[PDB]
Amino acid sequence: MKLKPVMRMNGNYARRLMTREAVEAVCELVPSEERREALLKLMDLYLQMKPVWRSTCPSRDCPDQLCQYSYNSQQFADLLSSMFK
DNA sequence: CTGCAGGGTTTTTGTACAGCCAGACAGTGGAGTACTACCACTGTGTAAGACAGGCCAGATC
DNA sequence: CACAGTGGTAGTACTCCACTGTCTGGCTGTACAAAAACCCTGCAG
DNA sequence: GATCTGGCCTGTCTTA
């Protein structure tokens, strides 16, 4: 991912950290093939709910993510309390 | 005094002649001009407290 | 789904150096009017 | 002897 180790988490390294690529690069590390599925699907959920708050006005630029936010966060929370509990 | 109406005033606003210089037009073949994405990649978020469990110290009986 | 940068490049695009004629727009003397905006004075309430 | 409380020291978390 071409990302140096860090002192403090800055928002820039925080934008290059959560992307599907970064996760699929750290997917090679964890041997369990169930977990790959889990954290990977987790990250995709997060990418889906991120533009909701981070975009200036979600009502226009990202409406379909917005309407799905509650349900999406639901799958997310259920995934944490289930697998990562 | 107000109202409008002939004309005054001076001054605008342009058209009237006629000659003439300037720079735009258009060509070119391409010059080398100027302004363009594009490329990874960055800088600014910076210190305390709360809370759980241990367990030893030491007062109280 | 920050943002305002950061220099070199290759891209593109535009706009320039000579040869020429031709064109419109614009200036100069006074003459000639018609508008421009007062203030007059004139005639009326 | 042995409680309770507070202690420090650790010891993790969360924001910064």
Side-chain angles (χ1 to χ4, degrees):
Chain A
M1 279 300 101
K2 296 308 183 51
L3 308 181
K4 86 187 158 70
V6 291
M7 80 161 182
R8 161 95 174 89
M9 192 75 53
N10 47 346
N12 191 26
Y13 174 63
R15 294 174 187 96
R16 289 191 190 183
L17 185 60
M18 314 169 298
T19 37
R20 220 176 184 191
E21 289 84 1
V23 167
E24 310 171 11
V26 80
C27 276
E28 153 155 338
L29 271 182
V30 46
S32 179
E33 298 80 7
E34 179 65 16
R35 307 291 298 183
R36 294 176 188 180
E37 201 294 334
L39 53 77
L40 198 155
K41 196 207 170 183
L42 187 70
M43 180 61 59
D44 184 73
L45 293 185
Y46 194 83
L47 265 61
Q48 276 308 97
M49 57 194 310
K50 179 165 167 288
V52 173
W53 75 80
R54 201 150 182 76
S55 192
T56 61
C57 170
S59 303
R60 184 177 61 244
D61 317 346
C62 55
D64 54 345
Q65 277 100 8
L66 172 59
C67 190
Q68 298 300 332
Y69 190 80
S70 297
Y71 163 77
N72 206 320
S73 61
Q74 183 69 268
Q75 331 205 91
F76 194 105
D78 197 10
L79 183 48
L80 286 189
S81 302
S82 73
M83 216 153 162
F84 286 106
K85 185 181 188 177

